[PDB]
């Protein structure tokens, strides 16, 4: 078994009214620390995932590295207590993108924000980026996640696409169709649930576990995925690409989409 938080962190959480999140489909625990002067956010991952891209210990390193680079939360407190990586952070600036256009019907504005993140990422210098997440490192991690049954291979939200009938089939296809990689700055989980906007621009990025070096089509692929499922009109997928000023590599896009199927 295990535990949770330390005494120190048990003080702050007591001082703020705590509310338990339910927006994190991940193995992490997320709590909002409602406060009088502000709100703080606590996120915790158990040992089983240490060293993995879910380990907040890593999300924290990356969160520290983006200071003065991208709009990310401020690392307040971090600790390893009872085989748990606990991160205390400040409340992202802005509104959740999913809740800024929740009613939606502002397709082009979403497409803009997505395309804005992309251009933005292709600005962060990865000369000193802490982690490299090339397919090699990622297929490595996946394999590992499967061997230790650390991944949900039964009840996930598959894409209606995934041509495969079992986990290893997919793994194999990935480990076998690896596109060439042009390393840029990758978020690792670009989606309206992990992005914050304000007054019309992006004002915050959170959920930075797989943040680091990675092919450029990785994030783009994700935006395509979201765009398609949430708007469902090839029309705005094209527009997205027009705003990016790039031609779609449907092979890479598909590929990278699949790579996320088991995470
Ligand atoms: N939070 C966004 C809200 O939830 C859905 O979006 C979610 C959904 O599309 C997408 O879920 C995708 C699936 O698709 C894809 N086929 C497999 C991939 N494992 C899964 O990933 C999801 O589960 C992971 C853990 N297994 C989490 O680590 C990750 O944060 C989350 N993106 O990620 C979004 C969560 O962020 C609604 N579609 C959207 O309209 C609504 O706004
Ligand atoms: N620093 C933060 N500021 C504001 N909201 C946050 C912050 N950290 C987490 N959240 C909220 O809680 C949810 C879960 O956080 P996230 O890191 O995305 O967990 P998971 O990796 O499970 O998706 C986010 O979608 C967001 O609603
Ligand atoms: Mg999230
Ligand atoms: Mg996550």
Give domain limits for the chain. 1-90, 91-263
Q: What is the CATH number of domain 1-90?
A: 3.30.200.20
Substitution site in 189, 202, 206 for ligand 2 pocket (most atoms within 8 Å of beta carbon)? 206
Measured from the CB, is residue 205 less than 6 Å from ligand 1? no
Q: How far away, in angstroms, is 90 Cα from ligand 2 center?
A: 11
Ligand 3 centroid to residue 23 C-alpha, Å: 6
Please name the residue whose Cα sits nearest to atom 28 of ligand 1: 26
Q: CA 29 to CA 68: how far, in whole Å?
A: 27
C-alpha 121/C-alpha 93 separation (Å) is: 18
Torsion angle of the four alpha carbons 211, 212, 215, 220, in this order, in degrees rounded to the nearest 10: 30
Its sign, for the CA torsion 100, 106, 111, 113, is negative
Resolution (A): 2.7
Spatial contact of 174 and 135, defined as CB atoms under 8 Å apart: yes
**What is the layout of strands, in order, in the sheet containing 75-80?**
17-20, 29-34, 39-46, 84-90, 75-80
Q: For a pocket test of ligand 2, which of 30, 39, 60, 198 has the largest count of ligand atoms closer than 8 A to its C-beta? A: 30
CA–CA dist 83, 168 (Å, integer): 30
Catalytic residues: 189
CA 261 from centre of chain:
14
Q: Whose alpha carbon is nearest atom 10 of ligand 2?
A: 41
Element (H, E) at 120: helix 107-121
Q: Is the CB of 27 under 6 A from ligand 1?
A: no
Q: What six digits make up the tokens of 79?
A: 């600790």
The answer to whether residues 119 and 111 touch, using CB atoms and an 8 Å cutoff, is: no
Contact yes or no for 82/2 (Cβ under 8 A): yes
Q: Cα(173)–Cα(178) distance, rounded to whole angstroms?
A: 8
The finding on whether 100 has its CB within 6 A of some atom of ligand 1 is: no
CB 43 within 8 A of CB 194: no
Which residues, other chains included, contact 63 with Cβ-Cβ below 8 Å and sequence gap of 6+? 72, 73, 75, 87, 89, 208
Question: How big is the chain, counted in residues?
Answer: 263
* Method by which the model was determined: X-ray
Residue 87 alpha carbon to ligand 4 centre in Å: 14
Q: What is the CA radius of gyration of the chain?
A: 18
Closest CA to 205 of 221, 219, 218, 215: 219
Q: How far is the CA of 28 from the centre of ligand 2 (A)?
A: 10
Report how far apart the first and last C-alpha atoms of the chain are (Å, whole number): 24
* Nearest Cα to Cα of residue 151 among 29, 263, 25, 259: 263
Residues 196, 94: contact at Cβ < 8 Å? yes
CB neighbour class for 212 (10 Å; exposed up to 12, middle 13-18, buried from 19): buried
Cα–Cα distance list, 52 to 139, 175, 185, 231 (Å): 12, 18, 19, 32
Q: Which ligand is nearest to the CA of 21?
A: 2
Task: Note the CATH architecture for domain 91-263.
Answer: Alpha-Beta Complex (3.90)
3-state DSSP call for residue 112?
helix
Q: How many CB atoms lie within 10 A of CB 55?
A: 21
């Amino acid at each position: 078994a295990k535990m949770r938080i330390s005494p120190e962190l048990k003080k702050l959480i007591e001082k703020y009214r705590c509310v338990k999140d339910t927006e994190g489909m991940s193995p992490a625990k997320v709590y909002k620390l409602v406060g009088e002067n502000e709100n703080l956010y606590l996120k915790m991952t158990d040992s089983r995932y240490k060293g993995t891209t879910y380990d907040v210990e890593r999300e924290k390193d990356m969160m520290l590295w983006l200071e003065g680079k991208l709009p990310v939360p401020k690392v307040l407190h971090f600790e390893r207590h009872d085989g748990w990586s606990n991160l205390l952070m400040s409340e992202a600036d802005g509104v959740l993108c999913s809740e800024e256009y929740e009613d939606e019907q502002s397709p082009e504005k979403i497409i803009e924000l997505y395309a804005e993140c992309i251009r933005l990422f292709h600005s962060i210098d990865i000369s000193d980026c802490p982690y490299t997440n090339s397919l090699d490192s990622r297929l490595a991690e996946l394999d590992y996640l499967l061997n230790n049954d650390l991944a949900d291979v039964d009840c996930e939200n598959w894409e209606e696409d995934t041509p495969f009938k079992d986990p290893r089939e997919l793994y194999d296809f990935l480990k076998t169709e690896k596109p060439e990689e042009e390393l840029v700055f990758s978020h690792g989980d670009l989606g309206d649930s992990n992005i914050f906007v304000k007054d019309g621009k992006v004002s915050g990025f959170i959920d930075l576990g797989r943040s680091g070096r990675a092919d450029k089509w990785y994030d783009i692929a994700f935006c395509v995925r979201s765009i398609r499922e949430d708007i469902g009109e090839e029309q705005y997928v094209e527009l997205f690409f027009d705003l990016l000023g790039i031609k779609p590599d449907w092979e890479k896009i598909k590929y990278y989409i699949l790579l996320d199927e088991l995470f």
